């Protein structure tokens, strides 16, 4: 588009204090995509009626996934572990 200025800036940002602060913690990381794809591939959510207000915190008794339909499974426990503002419209955008 314009030049290698983006790469130059990225290398400058990554070669100032990052190696010094990660001398003892820099290592290559693997990618188990072929094993982690089915874990997050199956995503479901009950229908939410309109003309209402989306819940703010995932602790109210009116939550459809907390009242009586929690179940352990794998996706359910994963969502329970990492449910930091991931439901609702965030869940819809993730599904998209």
């Amino acid at each position: 588009h314009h030049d290698r200025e983006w790469g130059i800036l990225s290398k400058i940002y990554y070669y100032i204090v990052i190696p010094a602060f990660s001398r003892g913690s820099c290592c290559t990381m693997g990618v188990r995509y072929d094993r982690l794809y089915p874990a997050l591939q199956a995503v479901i959510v009950p229908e939410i009626p309109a003309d209402e207000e989306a819940p703010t915190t995932p602790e109210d008794p009116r939550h459809p996934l907390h009242a009586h339909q929690l179940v352990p499974n794998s996706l359910n426990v994963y969502f329970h572990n990492a449910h930091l503002t991931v439901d609702g419209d965030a869940l819809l955008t993730l599904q998209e």
Partner: protein
């Protein structure tokens, strides 16, 4: 088409027809597999790919069915036409709780 011994029949046919929660629970409660010799246990990559494709199709169908409050969509890029001498409506994207629609 729901036998857990062969991981090729319940891949998309039993997933895209209805909600995948019940097949997922059945698979979880029915162990993983049994005798892998009398079956198409070879090339598990294709089975995994078709299962994930079926799961994605089921999720998309469920999202389309439940998306009764969001049906109109547009683009984000501007100046896509030569006749851009005016300023259209700005509005906002899907970044709010569903109250009006």
């Amino acid at each position: 088409s729901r036998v857990v011994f062969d991981p090729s029949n319940p891949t998309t046919f039993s997933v895209e027809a209805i909600a995948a929660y019940t097949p997922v629970a059945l698979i979880r409660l029915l162990n993983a597999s049994g005798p892998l010799q009398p079956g198409h246990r070879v090339d598990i990559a294709d089975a995994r790919s078709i299962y994930t494709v079926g799961a994605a199709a089921s999720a998309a169908r469920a999202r389309a069915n439940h998306n009764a409050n969001t049906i109109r969509r547009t683009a984000m890029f501007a100046e896509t036409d030569p006749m851009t001498w005016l300023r259209p409506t700005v509005g906002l994207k899907r970044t709010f709780n569903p109250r009006i629609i």
